[PDB]
Amino acid sequence: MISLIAALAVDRVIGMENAMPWNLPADLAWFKRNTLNKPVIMGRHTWESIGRPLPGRKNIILSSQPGTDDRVTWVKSVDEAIAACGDVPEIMVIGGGRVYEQFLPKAQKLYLTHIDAEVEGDTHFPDYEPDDWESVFSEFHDADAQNSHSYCFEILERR
Template identity: 55%
Template sequence: MRIAMIAAMAKNRVIGRDNKMPWHLPEDLRHFKAMTLSKPIVMGRKTFESIGRPLPGRHNIVISRNSQLSIEGVTCVTTFDEAMTMAGDCDELVVIGGGQLYQQLLPKADVLYLTLIDLDVDGDTVFPEWDDGSWQLQNSVTATNDKGLQYSFNTLFKKC
């Protein structure tokens, strides 16, 4: 099973502020849906709470320290190993946040789907730094939305 991470981040690595994304970029939301649909997605409890509901068309798995956590329509686990077991036989499992999970699981990731947004924003959550020498950019598509905001969808694979 391939372990992927998906995130949108500003130039200064910010991915969140007060458990929300500090921008509104519908193009990225469509990209997120396309990249995660029909796949198991793994997130921390705070990320789930910020979304507010299970995302349809995906096996939603929430990792929490609270072993008693129970959420309708969601598989709740306490470790990433449990999450992988619960994901079952799939080609790719996608980690969708938040910051603590990205930090913990980046060494296990095989692929990064990163939306880079041409902004510097204030925030309290950042995507962890990675060793550029360990990752190979496979694909990058740059666009500008109707409000003039430039962004790029990037796919990086871990080098063997």
């Protein structure tokens, strides 16, 4: 099964100038917890924004160019990415925008964080048909001393 995980600000913004302007440690804890010990698939731009391999996870990067780092696995197509994961229960697709768009039709599950933030961005989460998805978990949090915005963890499963 293929899953997508993402953090969306208002108007499905997910990034700006190859970075994420907000800082939500609670959300990054949620990301870690839901990805650890699973393969993660990402695009090249997202690899360059993270800046390092994510520990405890098989890092798989999509790029039409040859790899420039043997600490991670490089692939050249969507099908090859999926094959490189092997026989695992859950593949996590961690973006960015162009990668998300390609894996959304294959995905059975979405892990979305909705952040109450107004941010100008250049990258959006793909527009998905709400009828196709059933919310099976929701958890709202108010802002606190560590998290400057209110946010909502949501898990959706394809109907």
